[PDB]
Design a protein around this ligand. Structure first.
Ligand SMILES: CCC(=O)SCCNC(=O)CCNC(=O)[C@H](O)C(C)(C)COP(=O)(O)OP(=O)(O)OC[C@H]1O[C@@H](n2cnc3c(N)ncnc32)[C@H](O)[C@@H]1OP(=O)(O)O
Ligand SMILES: *C(=O)CCCC[C@@H]1SC[C@@H]2NC(=O)N[C@@H]21
Lengths: 507, 91
């Protein structure tokens, strides 16, 4: 046997991975293999595989059986491009030892993590694992620690995207907590530390695999997964589209792409969206879609914390991040869940030089013991902090309500904002007329007459605007034009801040 | 228009260049009736639509050449977006 024959035989096995029968089962279950997923994700022919001939070196529990050797050791690693842009990937292969993590497994992932940080290219992981490989013991625990160290080091340096394409258990479930976005596949992917078998054995509770850690739970209730997609093919198609929004590294400006949508057009549809009656809700998404280039908007966590909307869009070709209230849900109030999603999004966009647009319509915070005992104070500070420390352009437009401390939390001008616009329907006050007048004229006669005078003078955006809180009051139809003008001149903005080893977020 | 065919052709063009979005409209019905062979010839009675659409309105039916044009347009537009997606300012 020549060396070339041995090489060819290893190449053929590396492509089969766990073997054809395992691959057959992989398809029966409605899943693609790790290599098929990469072929879909990356530009055709752009993928270059690294370390395809690496095998484990572990010899306990008869693991040294040649029948227990598999080239690639359960991960496919390499580099490629999406639409001409460099990206690093890795994908875990469930058909080889259940996708469990070995020492060598982690080493290969770390290698990719180090090359991407050095050059400044994003890393996209496709995760699917049964947890640690118990046959090696403590070697796999060091594997996790090294991966975690790279994921922390890369934070704020390169984007880190993690798409879950199957179950994930043990220590593996923490890597999506360190990356920037986590995506899942409905009814296929899971995230949990221990399985239902442990829950039943430890405590008298009955739960199944979907209820404990299914995609629907994490995208609707726990707030862990940013979005779930119907199947593997649609998940990767949307991932390519998402990729096109982000810079390659934090040293780069927000990408600018060819755009055919005139930057100076008006949107007459905005003038009548906001009702004159204060108790009538409207859909904030109608405003967002009409302003953004070609009416394309990428919504994050559509089913979690619906009272606040965050997502990506482009204006005049440039990627921007959008944050705003949704008056339809809980009157547009802030609560614990909305502050968590908001602060996380704002901080990512600031780290990677993506401008922020804020659409404010917030009457205050969600009252009640459910929020008080939940630490609403500690959690609300997260969104205020995320805006106050931002150094990227911030353009705020107030569409209607801004009462109380929520005015400042939703990126008010006095938090180093660049511009602040009000629509004619905006009203900025410490509280509404009823509270303010009954407190001011407490115990006085003819309070209702005093309230009429108070409403005429203060129930409008003018007592704030004349003091410098608002830069202009614009016809809503011109909102897009005004924002476009600001974005194209604030893009060269640079500011300094006192040196600090690191930031200290309230947590 | 100056004649019966000019006014009908111009109507067909106006309907395809008439943008209504946000509600459900009846342009599909108007665009097919005006091009119906009985309408162009004039064999129209007050119960015309009830005999043409005895089972309800189904939408415009494509022939062989029209399906090829629709497939070619949809495929070329798909690629046009795929090519635009690759044109970045050079970093
Ligand atoms: C907390 C400590 C950490 O850091 S992670 C600790 C690791 N412990 C685990 O996750 C337990 C492993 N199993 C589970 O968690 C769940 O039951 C899983 C496997 C995720 C449910 O997936 P399910 O679709 O039922 O797969 P399965 O159990 O049929 O396994 C598929 C094939 O893979 C294998 N496999 C699985 N896990 C391991 C592992 N840790 N080490 C070695 N092999 C593993 C299974 O034996 C199975 O192979 P086969 O089908 O029996 O030929
Ligand atoms: C009705 O008259 C009173 C409504 C309750 C007050 C509301 S609830 C949400 C806003 N936040 C706040 O502190 N007060 C407002």
């Amino acid at each position: 046997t020549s060396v070339n024959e041995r090489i060819e035989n290893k190449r053929r096995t590396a492509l089969l991975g766990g073997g054809q029968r395992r691959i057959d089962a992989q398809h029966k279950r409605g899943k693609l293999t790790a290599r098929e997923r990469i072929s879909l994700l990356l530009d055709p022919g752009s993928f270059v595989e690294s370390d395809m001939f690496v095998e484990h070196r572990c010899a306990d529990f008869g693991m040294a059986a040649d029948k227990n050797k598999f080239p690639g050791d359960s991960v496919v690693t390499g580099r490629g491009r999406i639409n001409g842009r460099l990206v690093y990937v890795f994908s875990q292969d469930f058909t080889v030892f259940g996708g469990s993590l070995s020492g060598a497994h982690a080493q290969k992932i770390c290698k990719i993590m180090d090359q991407a940080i050095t050059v400044g290219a994003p890393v996209i992981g496709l995760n699917d694992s049964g947890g640690a490989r118990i046959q090696e013991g403590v070697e796999s625990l060091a594997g996790y620690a090294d991966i975690f160290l790279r994921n922390v080091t890369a934070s704020g340096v390169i984007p880190q995207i993690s798409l879950i394409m199957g179950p994930c258990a043990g220590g593996a479930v923490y890597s999506p907590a360190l990356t920037d976005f986590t995506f899942m596949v409905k009814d296929t992917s899971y995230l949990f530390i221990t399985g239902p078998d442990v829950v039943k054995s430890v405590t008298n509770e009955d739960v199944t695999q979907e209820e404990l850690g299914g995609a629907k739970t994490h995208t609707t209730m726990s707030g862990v997964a940013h979005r779930a997609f119907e199947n593997d093919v649609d998940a990767l198609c949307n991932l390519r589209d998402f990729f096109n929004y982000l810079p390659l590294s934090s040293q780069d400006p927000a990408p600018v792409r060819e755009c055919h949508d005139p930057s100076d057009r008006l949107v007459p549809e905005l003038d009548t969206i906001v009702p004159l009656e204060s108790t009538k809700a409207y859909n904030m998404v109608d405003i967002i879609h009409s302003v953004v280039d070609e009416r394309e908007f990428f919504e994050i966590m559509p089913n979690y914390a619906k009272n606040i909307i965050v997502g990506f869009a482009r204006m005049n070709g440039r990627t921007v991040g959008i944050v705003g209230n949704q008056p339809k849900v809980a009157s547009g109030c802030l609560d614990i869940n909305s502050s968590v999603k908001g602060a996380r999004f704002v901080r990512f966009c600031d780290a990677f030089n993506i401008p922020l647009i804020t659409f404010v319509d917030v009457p205050g915070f969600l009252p009640g013991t459910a929020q008080e005992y939940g630490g609403i104070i500690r959690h609300g500070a997260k969104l205020l902090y995320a805006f106050a420390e931002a150094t990227v352009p911030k353009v705020t437009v107030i569409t209607r309500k801004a009462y109380g401390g929520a005015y400042d939390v939703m990126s008010s001008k006095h938090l180093c904002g660049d511009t602040n616009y009000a629509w004619p329907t905006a009203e900025i006050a410490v509280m509404g007329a009823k509270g303010a007048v009954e407190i001011i004229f407490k115990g006085h006669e003819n309070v209702e007459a005093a309230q009429a005078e108070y409403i005429e003078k203060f129930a409008n955006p003018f007592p704030a605007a004349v003091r410098g809180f608002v830069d202009d009051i614009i016809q809503p139809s011109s909102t897009r034009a005004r924002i476009c003008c600001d974005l194209d001149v604030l893009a060269s903005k640079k500011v300094q801040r006192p040196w600090r080893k690191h930031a200290n977020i309230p947590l | 228009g100056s004649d019966r065919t000019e006014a009908l052709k111009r109507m067909a063009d106006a309907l395809d260049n008439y943008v209504i979005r946000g509600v459900t409209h009846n342009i599909a019905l108007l665009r097919e009736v005006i091009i119906n062979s009985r309408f162009v010839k004039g064999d129209i009675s007050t119960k015309f639509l009830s005999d043409v659409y005895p089972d309800g309105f189904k939408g415009h039916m494509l022939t062989k050449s029209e399906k090829n044009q629709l497939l070619a347009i949809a495929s070329s537009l798909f690629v046009a977006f795929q090519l635009r997606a690759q044109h970045f300012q050079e970093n």
